[PDB]
Enzyme design. Structure first.
Site, short mmCIF file in Angstrom:
data_model
loop_
_atom_site.label_atom_id
_atom_site.label_comp_id
_atom_site.label_asym_id
_atom_site.label_seq_id
_atom_site.Cartn_x
_atom_site.Cartn_y
_atom_site.Cartn_z
N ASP A 92 0.78 -1.23 0.00
CA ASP A 92 0.00 0.00 0.00
C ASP A 92 0.82 1.29 0.00
O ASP A 92 1.26 1.76 1.05
CB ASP A 92 -0.92 -0.08 1.24
CG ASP A 92 -1.93 1.04 1.31
OD1 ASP A 92 -1.92 1.93 0.45
OD2 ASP A 92 -2.73 1.01 2.27
N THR A 93 0.99 1.89 -1.18
CA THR A 93 1.76 3.12 -1.31
C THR A 93 1.11 4.34 -0.68
O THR A 93 1.77 5.36 -0.49
CB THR A 93 2.04 3.46 -2.78
OG1 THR A 93 0.80 3.65 -3.46
CG2 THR A 93 2.84 2.34 -3.46
N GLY A 94 -0.18 4.25 -0.36
CA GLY A 94 -0.88 5.36 0.25
C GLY A 94 -0.84 5.34 1.77
O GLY A 94 -1.33 6.26 2.43
C1 LIG Z 1 -11.12 3.06 -1.35
C2 LIG Z 1 -10.49 3.57 -0.03
C3 LIG Z 1 -9.83 4.76 -0.39
C4 LIG Z 1 -11.63 3.92 0.88
N1 LIG Z 1 -9.57 2.55 0.50
C5 LIG Z 1 -8.81 2.53 1.63
O1 LIG Z 1 -8.79 3.46 2.48
C6 LIG Z 1 -7.95 1.34 1.85
C7 LIG Z 1 -8.65 0.52 2.94
N2 LIG Z 1 -7.92 -0.77 3.36
C8 LIG Z 1 -8.67 -1.52 4.38
C9 LIG Z 1 -10.04 -2.04 3.97
C10 LIG Z 1 -10.18 -3.19 3.07
C11 LIG Z 1 -11.47 -3.73 2.63
C12 LIG Z 1 -12.63 -3.01 3.19
C13 LIG Z 1 -12.57 -1.89 4.07
C14 LIG Z 1 -11.25 -1.39 4.48
O2 LIG Z 1 -13.90 -1.57 4.32
C15 LIG Z 1 -14.96 -2.41 3.64
O3 LIG Z 1 -13.99 -3.29 2.95
C16 LIG Z 1 -6.63 -0.41 3.89
C17 LIG Z 1 -5.74 0.38 2.92
N3 LIG Z 1 -6.53 1.58 2.46
C18 LIG Z 1 -5.63 2.33 1.52
C19 LIG Z 1 -4.94 3.45 2.23
O4 LIG Z 1 -3.83 3.46 1.35
C20 LIG Z 1 -5.49 4.87 2.16
C21 LIG Z 1 -4.77 6.01 2.89
C22 LIG Z 1 -5.56 7.40 2.64
C23 LIG Z 1 -4.87 8.58 3.36
C24 LIG Z 1 -3.49 9.02 2.99
C25 LIG Z 1 -2.87 10.13 3.70
C26 LIG Z 1 -3.63 10.80 4.78
C27 LIG Z 1 -5.00 10.36 5.13
C28 LIG Z 1 -5.60 9.26 4.43
C29 LIG Z 1 -4.69 5.78 4.46
O5 LIG Z 1 -5.60 5.22 5.18
N4 LIG Z 1 -3.56 6.27 4.93
C30 LIG Z 1 -3.16 6.26 6.32
C31 LIG Z 1 -2.58 4.97 6.92
C32 LIG Z 1 -2.82 3.61 6.69
C33 LIG Z 1 -2.12 2.61 7.41
C34 LIG Z 1 -1.12 2.97 8.43
C35 LIG Z 1 -0.81 4.36 8.73
C36 LIG Z 1 -1.49 5.36 8.03
C37 LIG Z 1 -1.53 6.86 7.96
C38 LIG Z 1 -2.04 7.25 6.61
O6 LIG Z 1 -1.06 7.25 5.58
#
Ligand SMILES: CC(C)(C)NC(=O)[C@@H]1CN(Cc2ccc3c(c2)OCO3)CCN1C[C@@H](O)C[C@@H](Cc1ccccc1)C(=O)N[C@H]1c2ccccc2C[C@H]1O
Lengths: 99, 99
Positions: free
Chosen positions: A25-27
């Site tokens: 996960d690059t995000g």
């Molecule tokens: C379609 C969306 C966008 C809703 N997807 C996600 O959020 C997925 C969810 N899964 C999970 C998932 C899978 C399946 C599902 C579900 C959820 O719900 C129903 O089905 C886990 C991985 N994320 C991807 C993350 O990369 C997103 C990222 C967004 C962000 C970036 C920067 C600031 C705020 C928000 C995110 O959550 N980032 C944060 C982050 C993440 C991990 C650790 C530390 C940190 C801090 C921060 O970088």
């Protein structure tokens, strides 16, 4: 390896001597694993994403093999839907985005 | 180009004639943009991220230019802390994860 994105980028990881499925996960700034036991002292931490914030346990300097590559860094464990390998470990394995 | 992960993979995008900064996120299945009032019909939807679910508005067939490359697809609009480009669009510009 070169990985396409038509499917979730999942890889096998070995940690604490156990195998698990994780998402590259690059995000994600940090790495977070589902609830599990890890040896060592942990500190309470909070991280946020979409949906809000969650409380997690932070384990420092944990060795973890990601798809054959070795990394040693911070690992968070808490109520997450899936295991996520973030940028903190991705950089350790020389991971990059290309197009 | 090749994007390193020392910092958040932020790139410039063009949608609805506006330029914005968006995160190339391999862990996101969909594309989620910060609140913006795009013209056209949309359907209500729920998406889950780390801290829970958020209600978003789904728009289909939206033209979007990512770091110079064109793509077109479904885009979700809602209260997200950052613009996120998910796999549905990343596959269109031929983006890959490499290590
Ligand atoms: C379609 C969306 C966008 C809703 N997807 C996600 O959020 C997925 C969810 N899964 C999970 C998932 C899978 C399946 C599902 C579900 C959820 O719900 C129903 O089905 C886990 C991985 N994320 C991807 C993350 O990369 C997103 C990222 C967004 C962000 C970036 C920067 C600031 C705020 C928000 C995110 O959550 N980032 C944060 C982050 C993440 C991990 C650790 C530390 C940190 C801090 C921060 O970088």
């Amino acid at each position: 390896p070169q990985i396409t994105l038509w499917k979730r980028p999942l890889v096998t990881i070995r940690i604490g001597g156990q195998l698990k499925e994780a998402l590259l996960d690059t995000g994600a700034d940090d790495t977070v694993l589902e609830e599990m036991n890890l040896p060592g002292r942990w500190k309470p931490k909070m991280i946020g994403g979409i949906g809000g914030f969650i409380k997690v346990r932070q384990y420092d300097q944990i060795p973890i093999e990601i798809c054959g590559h070795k990394a040693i860094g911070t690992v968070l464990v808490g109520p997450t839907p899936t295991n996520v390998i973030g940028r903190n470990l991705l950089t350790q394995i020389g991971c990059t985005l290309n197009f």
